[PDB]
Each structure stands twice: as C-alpha cells, then as structure tokens.
C-alpha cells in the first residue's frame, strides 16, 4: 500500500501533530481519494525501524513503489505523475502565489522587536495574494477547482491563523476581505477538515520555536 509517515504531536504522540508539509501530502493523497496508512512519528524519541528508511530522520515520508520518499515537493508531484486523476496540477503562472507568506509569518511570530520591520514584511505577503484573489477567478488559487499550490498553501495559512491568533492576538487585517474568504474556502475543504491538526498542538508545536 501507499504508507506515510508524519510528525506527532507535541507532548501527544498519539494524534497528528502540526507539520505543514506533511499535511500537503495528506491533503494530495485526499483529493486523489486514494487509500493509505499514517504512521504517527515522535520526533523527539524517534523509532528505528523510522531511521532505517529515513536517513535524515525527516518527516513527511511516503512509501511508493517499495521505495520510501522525502520532501514534500517530490512526493506530490510523484502522486500527480501516477495518479493524474483528478488532476491538481497548477497553472506554472500561479504555482507561486502565497509563496512567501509562511517565511514572513515565521519572523513575524518569532519577533519580540515591534520595530523590527516583521509585521510589515508579512502584510506585503498578504497584500500581494490579495491582489492575486481579487484579480483571477476563484474560488481557488487558479480557478474552480482546488490544486496543487491551495494544498501547499492552506496549511500554512491555517498555522498563520492559528500561531498569530494565539500567541499575539493577531488577525489578518480585515482589509484584505479575498484572503478572509480564501482561507475560509480552504479550511472548509473536505481534505482539509479530515487531515487538520487540532489547533491545541499547533500550539504545542510552536510553543518551543516562538524564543531562542
């Protein structure tokens, strides 16, 4: 069978944890309706039989063929190429959008400096698949249908959310209305509500990474 392995979550090693990549190969195998098993993976008392078939002991990991696959980017572009339908597929032009959006909310999540220039390197992330979302039509990055770069992109919108929400009180400004809309688009996703992290153990995941 298709097998993957993920992160479990901090301080409950029994329920998904909060990686973001992983969660794009969740979601892909998802909307391709496809049948796999989850190996839940403590990071921090990591398994043998885990490092044998992941040399960098890093997550996510699928089992295709009877080969085991790191790195989120090739994993689901190895599910496209064997499965290709439903196609998810993104228009190179949009494969991009949002990009940068979870780089920036990690400064500005971490940042204890208000001057720092964090919070406004974030905003013109924002301000930019704003642009993007009021221009092109939707409800999806590229269209009608969800695709490959919504599924890189929900889940860490959903840290966005959840991390700022949380840990400083921060909302995504109400002046970016396509955003709001997206996202609630993306987290009412079938795919979405089956494979979320529950928020407690974004939380718990952050909680360690918020200071150095």
Same mark, same amino acid.
């Given at each position: &069978?298709?097998? @993957?392995?993920?992160? /479990?979550? %901090?301080? /409950?090693?029994?329920?998904?944890?909060?990686?973001?990549?992983?969660?794009?190969?969740?979601?892909?195998?998802?909307?391709?309706?496809?049948?796999?098993?989850?190996?839940?993976?403590?990071? $921090? +008392?990591?398994?043998?039989?885990?490092? !044998?078939?992941? =040399?960098?002991? #890093?997550?996510?990991?699928?089992? @295709?063929?009877? #080969?085991? %696959?790191? +790195?989120?980017? %090739?994993?689901?572009?190895?599910?496209?190429?064997? *499965? =290709? +339908?439903?196609?998810?597929?993104?228009?190179?032009?949009?494969?991009?959008?949002?990009?940068?959006?979870?780089?920036?909310?990690?400064?500005?999540?971490?940042?204890? !400096?208000?001057?720092?220039? $964090?919070?406004?390197?974030?905003?013109?992330?924002?301000? &930019?698949?704003?642009?993007?979302?009021? $221009?092109?039509?939707?409800?999806? @990055?590229?269209?009608?249908? %969800?695709?490959?770069?919504?599924?890189?992109? /929900?889940? #860490?919108? *959903?840290?966005?959310?959840?991390?700022?929400?949380?840990?400083? $009180?921060?909302?995504?400004?109400?002046?970016?209305?396509?955003?709001?809309? *997206?996202?609630?688009?993306?987290?009412?996703?079938?795919?979405?509500?089956?494979?979320?992290?529950?928020?407690? *153990?974004?939380?718990?995941?952050?909680?360690?990474?918020?200071?150095?």
């Amino acid at each position: &069978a298709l097998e @993957i392995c993920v992160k /479990a979550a %901090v301080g /409950a090693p029994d329920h998904l944890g909060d990686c973001p990549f992983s969660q794009r190969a969740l979601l892909t195998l998802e909307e391709k309706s496809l049948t796999y098993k989850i190996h839940l993976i403590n990071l $921090s +008392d990591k398994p043998q039989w885990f490092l !044998d078939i992941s =040399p960098q002991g #890093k997550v996510p990991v699928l089992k @295709i063929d009877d #080969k085991w %696959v790191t +790195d989120s980017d %090739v994993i689901v572009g190895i599910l496209e190429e064997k *499965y =290709p +339908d439903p196609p998810l597929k993104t228009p190179a032009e949009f494969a991009s959008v949002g990009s940068n959006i979870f780089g920036t909310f990690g400064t500005f999540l971490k940042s204890k !400096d208000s001057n720092d220039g $964090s919070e406004h390197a974030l905003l013109v992330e924002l301000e &930019a698949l704003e642009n993007h979302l009021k $221009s092109h039509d939707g409800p999806f @990055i590229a269209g009608e249908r %969800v695709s490959a770069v919504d599924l890189s992109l /929900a889940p #860490k919108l *959903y840290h966005l959310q959840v991390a700022l929400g949380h840990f400083k $009180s921060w909302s995504v400004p109400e002046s970016f209305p396509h955003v709001h809309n *997206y996202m609630k688009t993306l987290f009412s996703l079938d795919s979405f509500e089956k494979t979320k992290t529950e928020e407690k *153990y974004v939380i718990s995941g952050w909680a360690p990474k918020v200071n150095p």
